[model samples]
Target: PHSIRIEGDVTLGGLFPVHAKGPSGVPCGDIKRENGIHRLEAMLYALDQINSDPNLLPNVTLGARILDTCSRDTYALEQSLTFVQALIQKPEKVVGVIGASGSSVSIMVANILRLFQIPQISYASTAPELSDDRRYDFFSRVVPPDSFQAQAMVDIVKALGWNYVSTLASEGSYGEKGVESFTQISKEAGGLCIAQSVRIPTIDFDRIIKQLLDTPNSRAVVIFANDEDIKQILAAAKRADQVGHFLWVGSDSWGSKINPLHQHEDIAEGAITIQPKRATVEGFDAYFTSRTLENNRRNVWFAEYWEENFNCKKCTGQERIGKDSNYEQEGKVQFVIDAVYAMAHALHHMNKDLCYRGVCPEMEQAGGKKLLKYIRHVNFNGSAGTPVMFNKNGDAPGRYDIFQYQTTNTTNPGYRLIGQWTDELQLNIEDMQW
Candidate 1:
């Protein structure tokens, strides 16, 4: 049996926050509750499922080298250099990669992956800058681009009768492009953006909050930011005692329950967020809830998470995780599984196309350039039972589900599905909780 390697450069947000030596030589604060852990687990689960299915690859095994990019473009670039260096040391066939969740990370790594002709299927990177095939031929995504998401955000605002709103976006292609699109859409819809603020990590949080609150006749704020940047904004809001003051609207980057907004549920009441429409995968919940040290011996992160969640330092490897049953797979988890399947189906079709006289060749012979052709033609039903296909721009027309954060109950303060945004840019609101 031969093996095909897929590098997974996931931007696991704040699961383990970055620690840097300050000017005084003291370490900064640690991260909490780890976002995208479920996505990582889902990718592993999909690989195992693919490896076990004989009909998919027959005698071939799928291998992956997973890395945490810490949700930064610099870390993503560093990881990309490592991958290319490994390729140079041993010119083995490492066909494709899975992710670097943020669009900025994907943009940072796309040039390198393109140089090597290595295909990358991103799960959550939605930057519109990657739409040019000439620039990023090897880059594609399972999620829709920010254009559609921007339209959805504007549609939501208009539907909810919010005519005057403020815009807060991170200082990146994903944020800037999304904000531009939303601005155009909202302007065409006869609405106005009263105030706009761009987020820089080192910027003054108090000043940003002041600008947000200073807007007149605009109690609605549309924010396009990732988990890390949004955490700073939330903290600033809490510090300024401006929590629960505005009708917060969010983009897909930090829209789900796994986002940092969950930490300040008391302040985030009546927050409306948008995420890719999710479908339930059959065995994912069982695989997630049944995790233990014995079964997942190689997963160091799982062990660490167990200690964090259950507060058990010593383990006999029999302790079950998620005892309260509060955890569930977010939308990104489904996309991660779909990204793996897309790669697998591409390989399966490539194998079939290259096979001569019913004798299959080794994966190394297929090469990155040859597989790119087959990857473009890949079409299949994913683990979520959704049709997995790509368009001309290597993008998909994804529907989004709208969620509302209601912290009326302290114990279960999370997102509740209230509406949907279709691919046609129509917002169908079933629950008007906001």
Candidate 2:
């Protein structure tokens, strides 16, 4: 039997601090946590439903088998390889894998899985190069590439009439992509990313922070790194509280409830950022609250709202009974849950010999190929707003929104959705510089 173990970090739970530097850098003091707990919770609930579905073959049940691949250092890569090797050694027929948040980490795992002819789909690996070569058929992504965010930010900057800017990035695939995308955005828009700065991955940035502060004519700066990098960069910037007249911008990864920058809202007071909102255009707040409260779960509600607003109705969890809705915990089980239903759904349609265990691993591969073939035209409404339609490249087409983290004296702090960009809004932005 093909068992889909949705393994990923289950313990690295907390708002990781963004780096800070003495006398230079974005001033973000007192780092707070930014966990993917919301997505984890939603995935858990969706998988639970799939496990209970009778369509799966007899004697087979899907569940989470998680492992922590701590932040995206080379060490994380070692942990990931160790996990995959152990899975290969197990008696259970492990079909595929789902994550290791960093694009570089996903690239390492996907390449390894390709050697084994196994599939690995990332719920959020937006690094562009991962799916570029048709050779790595093992890789798939649930979210769009970082290119989209870079382009979107360029568009917003042009709209705001900024023509010169500087960029601060981590020295990894994620950072490289961000710099390239934003640079292209600037070049295309007739502007310049004159000042480019890079930091060591997953570490504090003391050296690079000073470099960015030293540059002039850059009235704005774009942060193109994960929450950790952004935290440190912003902390340095805020603490120094550079009075230079410049506006700060960050990529989608910058949003976190707990961070020095988030806490020091004054730093981002007029800053703009590109981020995703709950998918619904109307009644989203109410729907979100209802689902979150009823299921006695808050994590799943966030991911479910993303699905409801962005994907089809199948994974909408709209099948709520009575006044009570349902949700699940945030863990590895959910990936198995989705993979199981997807696998069983494919088997349900194949010839009898192909449908059961021991018949033939030849007729249908347990990895994503068979499931994609079965689901090609199926238009699966997964938990995310994206319908499960694998493109020729297997990357899911989706939407994103730009928001400003609004800070007030009051206790409630949340991002304000100000604009949106989707397939319908794709357009060439005028060159803008900071």
Candidate 3:
């Protein structure tokens, strides 16, 4: 049983990162783990809200079997199979799945889920390959694809008059696809590529840094990598005795959070990044602030996180979690909430049509096929009043907020949103510090 509920009309499998396991099979910062918790909590909050509502799924209860994939594709594939095995024994327990944050993890799990015809709604996976309906028939994502993000990155470069740029990408589908799209779009827009695309974690960092610093014409470099790769690159930069001289451009993966680059502010300052637009989930702050071990005792990591965050040996149930702390609403958490509500609303609509009493006939008839049809056609106002709907490619319209890292005072540095990319491919920019 997961944190949400024990029994329900249907169960949805959730894959979140309870630990800070990175793609290189190494544990990352505690901040990454804490960020993952908020995503899981958002799902719990959404499920409770949906269960209590009379209009949606009146008497139908929703259950969850959430698994921590540790942000690795191997672990995600293993956990996904466990769900399938359980379905073989308990046929009516699980109806669908939501998450496995990274694009690589989502792709691995989706291939497994497609065989069973299970519905999957990913909140954060934005790789363009997942949009193939022939390959992933049961898959859909609430976030936009990398194609749009790529175009946005190129548009930003064009607007800033940076014609010659280098590219750095992670060794995965997400990074490869993102950089590929970016390169294609930039070339079409008359931009020149000054350096070859470099893959992280396998490159000669000293040589790459020398090359980047030596090429005075290549003032801009676009990096499409995750947090872990960024950490590696930053470490190499420090080793090369280089500071921030050229412009650094980041994709959505490691754009918003700068904890890895905190110690090297001079190297990361003035970096421009495209971050996924975060929707405001109402009441999340209040609910998150009041969380304690008393209400979430079963969550083993909750106590540890509280102690680390509040610097308390024992939580007294009176500590405000996110009040004056670094904790804030993350974009992935909002999308997780949207993914849950999407499933809930789809189930509600299916029940309205298929359920005779309070239950539908069979799992296959009710959720596997019929529910997917409804889910594909679902269109509604999200919690933040933004329209939530999937297109024919099973991707939501791309929307992004451009941020520039700047020092507020001498002590504090942060990324501030200065521009936005609309669904119509229009750019709304303000004067940026970068």
Candidate 4:
């Protein structure tokens, strides 16, 4: 009734083929629905490279099954369960999942997967609390959590010598996590937000602007929202003529290379923000030009590294935030890419079964448990620049940078470098422990 072929090479015109076809009928698994084509493309690239290597996983043929983990709500994870169960029913199928991009969405999916003893790795979810409890021994990620970024942000503010601030954030998982992290750390620094937190909805800035401008001695205003919300907040600040009045700080949300004030630098006159330093290295320019030149698609993420190479004639270089500003969107993308490849490599080393031996009560026991142990301490050097190290809790051990934006014409007038944070910058977590 069915035919299965175990083949080593997948190719088109002798070039290595990427993108595994989803199961027959409708293939709208998580890959299609979550704009995860690039992610899948990355997984295929890594798998192809690994499969071709003579020294890696010599005889075993690697394959995957795609499951739809709906992240819009809890129901999505439920659907993912059904899909995964179907795969498990297949006697010959090897089982593992490589994704769920949404942070909160992935958390829900992770909870369900953990119960099934299915080892799951997410490429982009950084919600602070997901891996902290450590209940999901099978859970892991290629990137660090928001805890590092949140702590980095606190240190960023104190370094600038500011005492009081306010938060204008989006209303969901990203913003709420940031607010809690910031509040907890700010107290340790003897600083605090002056105005009660204002959640930005619909990107409207009129009321937020009035509040920002009115806060007395408000040295900085942290905008903890998305790129759109950040743009709107800046626009409102300009309209209220409050650009120079308070320093602007940002959360992990501002990940794109396109500065919010690229066309209108005036709105960013005296602002400062902290995100990961995605750029600020050598050979970065040629890297961008080569990748984007032949393809001709503007790398939206280039701004993070743009000043490192291709600045306009009258460039200051300092104004662009560089790599530190990419902790959220673009950083997550990079993290996930690294995670998929590293996970595959880890599995190869462990030689584990696709499913758990003990929990399933049906699958071969030794194989599943062996695979889970390999996942615990997986480490790989990322293609970009980061060294991906997964600890016991499955969080990557990495540092984040911080920067400010100066709207000066001679200096490229959009972003500015504030400072860098190493372990030298970290506050002891115990100091703020509840």
The root-mean-square deviation over C-alpha atoms between each candidate and the true structure, in angstroms, is 6.1, 11.1, 4.6, 10.8
Q: Give the deviation of candidate 1 from the true structure as CA RMSD.
A: 6.1
The list of candidate 4 runs beyond 4 A from truth reads: 1-35, 82-95, 188-194, 277-332, 352-369, 409-414, 426-434
lDDT agreement with native, every candidate: 0.68, 0.51, 0.75, 0.54
Tell me the tens digit of each residue's lDDT in model 4 across 129-226: 77764665666766667777767777756755666778777887787776777777777667665565677762357788776667657767777787
Stronger candidate by lDDT (3 vs 4)? 3
lDDT at 166, model 4? 80
The candidate that achieves the highest TM-score relative to the unseen native structure: 3
lDDT of 1 by residue, 68-163 (tens): 555666655666664554445423345677856777778777777788777888887787777787888878888888878888887777777787
Q: Per-residue lDDT for 58-88 in model 2, tens only?
A: 3344445433333443444454454344345
**Reference-based TM-score, model 4:** 0.71
Question: Candidate 3 has what TM-score?
Answer: 0.80
**If the candidates were sorted by their TM-score against the true structure, best first, what order would they fall in?**
3, 1, 4, 2
Tell me the TM-score of each prediction against the true structure: 0.74, 0.62, 0.80, 0.71
lDDT by residue (92-188, candidate 3, tens digit) is 3678899578888888898888887788999888888788988888899988889888888888888777778988888777888889888888778
Residue-level error in angstroms, candidate 2, position 60 = 6.3
Candidate 1 yields a Cα-based lDDT of: 0.68
**Greater-TM-score candidate between 3 and 4:** 3
